[PDB]
């Protein structure tokens, strides 16, 4: 049974993943860290086993790893697409340097290490329909460039030092806890909020732009399941995984089915569009399904039902 360290643990994936790990292996077997502390309304507030760690401080990062003695690490901090184009130096620092430090610690302390990649690692030469695990990688964002380096450097640590590096290329991840903002796939949560508030939604992604997506509970299952797999079953270090693909118009139809009313949406291109257009429409995740049993239990309508129930509970929006 593992002892799990999570870094950048207070963000979108880390919050839900931290809780799930605590449930499965026990709070004493999990250490949750982030450069920031949790808000008083954050789900990890007041919990034991939550610490403050700037992963750019390699000495502090090592200090924490020595003290806790993890056998597994999920290294989550990154600056993602939209922010990274505006603040590329910060993206290069965080996405390259924290990763280098993590991998050096995984070597030194014999840690099985997960670092997520992303469909943003692909660009317009990838083959946009059912994109393969091995293909041409020509990302159009600095974030994506940094994640190609993440994939290749992690794989080198495996080959050279036997570090047990594992990764998936995550699609857009949807969850109810997330505050709608300007992220590349934030149109989807904005749309759920608008529907609940019965207000006009102005969507920055074009209506028929399809992307690979996944609902959070499926994401968490896979993130645990890949780390549990015996090494001998893994034929590669980096796997595509997907939930289902959808466009904004499809998400709108889903919401209208689950609310039984019309939501008003106007499509006005924002910064997310050019980024999303350079990404695949759908992924081939057959290697993940075959090697370690990646599976998906939600479809778009199940997800919409759950979201429309969870958002009022979490954020105080009007319910259906």
Ligand X SMILES: NC(=O)c1ccc[n+]([C@@H]2O[C@H](COP(=O)([O-])OP(=O)(O)OC[C@H]3O[C@@H](n4cnc5c(N)ncnc54)[C@H](O)[C@@H]3O)[C@@H](O)[C@H]2O)c1
Binding residues for pyruvate: 81, 118, 143, 184-185
Taking the CB of residue 20, how many other CB atoms lie within 10 A of it? 18
Q: In the chain, what are the helix, strand and coil shares in percent, each to the nearest 5?
A: 45, 15, 40
Query: Looking only at residues 70 through 89 of this chain, which bind ligand X when binding is defined by CB under 6 A?
Result: 76-78, 80
Output 60 or 259, the one with its CB closest to ligand X.
60
Which range binds Cl ion by CB under 5 A, 76-84, 150-158, 252-260, 296-304?
Answer: 76-84
Minimum distance of Cl ion from residue 83's CB (angstroms): 6
Q: Which of 138, 249, 259, 286 binds a second copy (CB under 8 A)?
A: 138
Output 21 or 78, the one with its CB closest to ligand X.
78
HSE, CB side, 13 Å, CA atoms: give it for residue 168. Answer: 30
Give me the phi and psi of 197, to 5 degrees please. Answer: -80, -5
Minimum distance of a second copy from residue 78's CB (angstroms): 15
HSE, CB side, 13 Å, CA atoms: give it for residue 222. Answer: 31
Taking the CB of residue 231, how many other CB atoms lie within 10 A of it? 10
Query: Looking only at residues 68 through 107 of this chain, which bind a second copy when binding is defined by CB under 8 A?
Result: 85, 88, 92, 96, 100
Residue in the block written with tokens 């949790």: 38
Q: Is 114 helix (H, G, I), strand (E, B) or coil?
A: strand
CB contact burial 283-314 (16+ within 10 A = b; e otherwise): bbbebbeeebebebebebeebbebbbeebeee
CB 236 within 8 A of CB 286: no
- DSSP code at position 27: G
- Contact letters (x/-) for ligand X, 99-138, by CB under 6 A? -----------------x-x--------------------
- DSSP code at position 131: B
Question: Which residues, other chains included, contact 295 with Cβ-Cβ below 8 Å and sequence gap of 6+?
Answer: 218, 221, 222, 289
| Enclosing H/E stretch for 302 | helix 300-315
Minimum distance of a second copy from residue 263's CB (angstroms): 35
Is 187 known to be catalytic? no
User: If contact means CB under 5 to 8 A according to the sort of partner, which of ligand X, Cl ion, a second copy, none does residue 238 touch?
Assistant: none
User: If contact means CB under 5 to 8 A according to the sort of partner, which of ligand X, Na ion, Cl ion, none does residue 136 touch?
Assistant: none
**Interface with Na ion, residue 116, by CB under 5 A:** no
Which range binds ligand X by CB under 6 A, 2-10, 37-45, 104-112, 232-240?
Answer: 2-10
Minimum distance of ligand X from residue 15's CB (angstroms): 8
- At 186, list the tokens: 């934030």
Beta bridge partners of 216: none
Which range binds ligand X by CB under 6 A, 10-18, 129-137, 197-205, 272-280?
Answer: 10-18
- At 232, list the tokens: 């001998």
Q: Which of 134, 264, 299, 301 binds a second copy (CB under 8 A)?
A: 134
Q: Which of 82, 148, 189, 275 binds a second copy (CB under 8 A)?
A: 148
Q: Which of 94, 148, 258, 275 binds ligand X (CB under 6 A)?
A: 94
- DSSP code at position 97: I
Q: Is 170 helix (H, G, I), strand (E, B) or coil?
A: strand
Output 179 or 268, the one with its CB closest to ligand X.
179
Residues lying near a second copy in the complex (CB under 8 A) are found at 85, 88, 92, 96, 100, 125, 134-142, 145, 148-149, 152-153, 155-156, 159-160
Binding positions for ligand X, rule: CB under 6 A: 7-8, 10-14, 34-36, 53-56, 76-78, 80, 94, 98, 116, 118, 170, 172-173, 185
Tell me which residues are annotated as active site: 143
């Amino acid at each position: 049974m593992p002892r799990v360290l999570v870094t950048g643990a207070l963000g979108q994936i880390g919050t839900d993943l931290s809780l799930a790990l605590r449930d499965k292996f026990g709070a004493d077997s999990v250490l949750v860290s982030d450069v920031v502390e949790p808000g008083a309304k954050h789900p990890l507030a007041g919990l034991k086993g939550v610490e403050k760690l700037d992963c750019l401080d390699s000495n502090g990062f090592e200090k924490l790893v020595k003290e806790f003695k993890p056998t597994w690490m999920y290294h989550l901090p990154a600056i993602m697409s939209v922010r990274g184009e505006a603040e590329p130096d910060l993206a290069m620092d965080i996405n390259v340097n924290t990763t280098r430090y993590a991998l050096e610690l995984a070597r030194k302390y014999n840690i099985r290490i997960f670092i997520p990649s992303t469909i943003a690692a692909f660009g317009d030469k990838c083959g946009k329909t059912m994109t393969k695990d091995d293909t041409i990688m020509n990302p159009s964002t600095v974030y994506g460039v940094t994640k190609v380096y993440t994939e290749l450097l992690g794989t080198w640590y495996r080959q050279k030092y036997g570090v047990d590096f594992r990764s998936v290329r995550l699609p857009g991840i949807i969850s109810a806890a997330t505050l709608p903002g300007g992220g590349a796939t934030d149109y989807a949560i904005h749309m759920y909020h608008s529907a609940l508030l019965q207000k006009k939604c102005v969507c920055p992604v074009l209506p028929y732009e399809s992307l690979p997506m996944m609902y959070m509970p499926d994401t968490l299952n896979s993130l645990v399941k890949i780390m549990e797999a015996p090494l001998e079953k893994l034929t590669r270090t980096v796997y595509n995984i997907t939930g289902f693909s959808f466009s904004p118009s499809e998400l709108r139809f889903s919401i209208e089915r689950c609310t039984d009313r019309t939501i008003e949406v106007e499509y006005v291109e924002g910064p997310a569009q050019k980024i999303a257009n350079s990404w695949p429409d759908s992924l081939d995740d057959s290697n993940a399904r075959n090697d370690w049993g990646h599976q998906v239990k939600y479809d778009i309508d199940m997800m919409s039902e759950d979201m429309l129930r969870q958002i009022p509970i979490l954020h105080g929006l009007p319910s259906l």
